[PDB]
Amino acid sequence: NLDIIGKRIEKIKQEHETSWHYDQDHPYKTWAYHGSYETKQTASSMVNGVVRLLTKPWDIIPMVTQMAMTFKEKVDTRTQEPKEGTKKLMKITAEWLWKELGKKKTPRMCTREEFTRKVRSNAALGAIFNKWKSAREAVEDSGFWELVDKERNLHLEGKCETCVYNMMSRAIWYMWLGARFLEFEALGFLNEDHWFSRENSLSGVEGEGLHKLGYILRDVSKKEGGAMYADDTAGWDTRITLEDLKNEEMVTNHMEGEHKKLAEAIFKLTYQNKVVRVQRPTTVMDIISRRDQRGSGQVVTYGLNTFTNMEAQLIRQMEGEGVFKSIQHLTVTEEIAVKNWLVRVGRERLSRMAISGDDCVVKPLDDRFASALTALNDMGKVRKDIQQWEPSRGWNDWTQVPFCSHHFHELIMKDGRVLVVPCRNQDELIGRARISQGAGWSLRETACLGKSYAQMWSLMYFHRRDLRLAANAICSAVPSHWVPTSRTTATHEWMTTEDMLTVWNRVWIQENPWMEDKTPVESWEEIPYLGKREDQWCGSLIGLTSRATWAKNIQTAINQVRSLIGNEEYTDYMPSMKRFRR
Ligand SMILES: CC(C)N1CCN(C(=O)c2cccs2)CC1
Ligand SMILES: [Zn+2]
Ligand SMILES: [Zn+2]
């Protein structure tokens, strides 16, 4: 408690000495409350006019139009201390998992230089506005780095002054850039050096890409075993226990010198003790604390989520195989059994899973996994939308399994080669492309974001008739040489001015380890679609009058957008499709 957070608390109290008040009508039960002070402020979602003008039939589909309009009772919940047997299973598994992840990797500090280049090419390192305008500016001013230095020497003493969270099934905890640097310095290696790559972690998919995920699920399906299980957790970040945060901190056991102490301080002072400021309309800024739950940068959150999910799913697999009998208490011979299971089959059991942060697919040895619920419930990883003790409903066909908001189709090319393609409800794809984030967008920037969506569709969703047509229309309506843009940056091969057929060939043929025959595709007409009925099942408008008029008259929509943008160099991409090729 207050010895570790007090300094952070004391500092904030004094910047607002003409405001501090210990409110007695504060809503917090599970968060420790400290005080309040005076503020007054709030960013909603704008429509992309380039995409909307070129998707007119969807103007009357509520699933699309409703996406552009507009539970904090979950962050104010408490997770119970796991039983002693559960805690022993987690500590043993965590120790073993960090060793396996560390066998072919070296922990190392990330640098000012690496951090500087990141901010100058835009990731989403959730920072704040205020002393400097953007992150871009703060990074060149050596004053900033003196601020960073002061804090860094404080962390080496085992104390913290400025590492405070700012709140805003989505609650996002922004920190000041300096605190984000110190997090990146100590823990950025997990992401930067690909600790959760499939090659290194066996369960992970970090850096894999939406064109690989389907092939990976199909490889899991080839394993002997039962159904494929894909149970979502109800609010994963809110169910991270102090026991989880301590098993995550054991990565420091693999570190040395300065790095080890710097990483130790992030875990001790910012993760296992937290200070947060929250808006409240009744507008006072509330200063609250708690030890548990997930609040890190979104990128470190991804890696530690993947780690703890890998651990939880190996333990659920142990329970199904009867490796331990009760969570209440692990016997001595049960520890040697768990240890020997990990040594003997640990890597094989990791290869049975695909895990992306809080999202998982598991193909266990058999269906006893379905009713192996005691450790999973006791770790606080309670399944979403099923009763606590009801057995999991698994999937018999890898093509129906949900993963990373997608399902995957097996699609045979006219030449016999096999594509495993990503897919989701087409209303969701069109509805997202029609939305832009933030304000001050020029017409050119709006057009370049439309082009980014269009190129993603050509590359990932070419097999959907409506998206290949709309992608070609958007790429025809935006000047040929204008560069696709985005304000936050799965591998993004569509972010390029290269010809999309050349990128398709590189991604689906040349670089595709599941494709033996490397014969390049010479035209878009070689590249197949889903069956017509499968396309409709996944949300296609083919066979509607609205869609037929849209397709037939597409050049008129293209010309509307070209007239708005003005006299620029445009390419006609519609003759890449059979029906427009005269
Ligand atoms: C059974 C149902 C899915 N329909 C089959 C016939 N049909 C077409 O042939 C096409 C029209 C426009 C492009 S393809 C529309 C869809
Ligand atoms: Zn700090
Ligand atoms: Zn589909």
Residue 138 and residue 148: Cα distance in Å, rounded?
A: 11
Is 458 part of a structural domain of the chain? Answer: yes
Q: Is the CB of 543 within 6 Å of ligand 1?
A: yes
Is 36 part of a structural domain of the chain? Answer: no
Token pair for residue 546? 């609205």
Token pair for residue 234? 């109800």
Is 116 part of a structural domain of the chain? Answer: no
Residue 307 and residue 336: Cα distance in Å, rounded?
A: 23
- 544 CA distance to ligand 1 centroid (A)? 9
Buried/exposed code over 463-487 (b: 16+ C-beta within 10 A; e: otherwise): bbbbbbbbbbbbbbbbbeebebbee
Residue 9 and residue 37: Cα distance in Å, rounded?
A: 12
Instruction: Give the closest residue (by CA) to ligand 1 atom 13.
Output: 542
- Cα dist from 366 to 68, 314, 369, 387, 446, whole Å: 43, 14, 7, 22, 50
Question: Residue 545's domain spans which residues?
Answer: 50-55+403-576
Q: 197: which residues sit within 8 A by CB, 6+ positions away?
A: 204, 206, 207, 208
- 290 CA distance to ligand 2 centroid (A)? 16
Is 494 part of a structural domain of the chain? Answer: yes
- Give the Cα-Cα-Cα angle 382, 388, 394 (nearest 5 degrees): 80
Is 190 part of a structural domain of the chain? Answer: no
> What is the experimental resolution, given in Å to one decimal place?
1.8
Is 483 part of a structural domain of the chain? Answer: yes
Confirm whether residue 155 is marked as ligand binding: yes
Identify the H or E element spanning 407. Answer: strand 407-412
Is 268 part of a structural domain of the chain? Answer: no
Residue 466 and residue 469: Cα distance in Å, rounded?
A: 5
Residue 101 and residue 200: Cα distance in Å, rounded?
A: 6
- 462 CA distance to ligand 3 centroid (A)? 12
Identify the H or E element spanning 418. Answer: strand 418-423
End-to-end CA separation in angstroms for the chain: 74
Q: Is the CB of 542 within 6 Å of ligand 1?
A: yes
- Give the Cα-Cα-Cα angle 137, 142, 144 (nearest 5 degrees): 65
Is 210 part of a structural domain of the chain? Answer: no
Count of C-beta atoms within a 10 Å radius of residue 385 = 7
Residue 505, by phi and psi: left (phi above 0), alpha (psi -120 to 50) or beta?
A: alpha
Please give the tally of structural domains in the chain. 1
Residue 427 and residue 40: Cα distance in Å, rounded?
A: 37
- 421 CA distance to ligand 1 centroid (A)? 21
Instruction: Give the closest residue (by CA) to ligand 1 atom 1.
Output: 533
Residue 202, by phi and psi: left (phi above 0), alpha (psi -120 to 50) or beta?
A: left
Instruction: Give the closest residue (by CA) to ligand 1 atom 5.
Output: 532
Token pair for residue 89? 């299973």
Q: Is the CB of 552 within 6 Å of ligand 1?
A: no
Token pair for residue 324? 């331990």
Closest ligand 1 atom to 543 CA: 15
Sign of CA dihedral 518, 519, 520, 526: negative
Which of these, 168, 163, 165, lies nearest to 288 by C-alpha position?
Answer: 165
Residue 46 and residue 32: Cα distance in Å, rounded?
A: 37
Confirm whether residue 409 is marked as ligand binding: yes
Residue 295, by phi and psi: left (phi above 0), alpha (psi -120 to 50) or beta?
A: beta
Q: Is the CB of 532 within 6 Å of ligand 1?
A: yes
Query: Strand, helix or coil at 194?
Result: coil
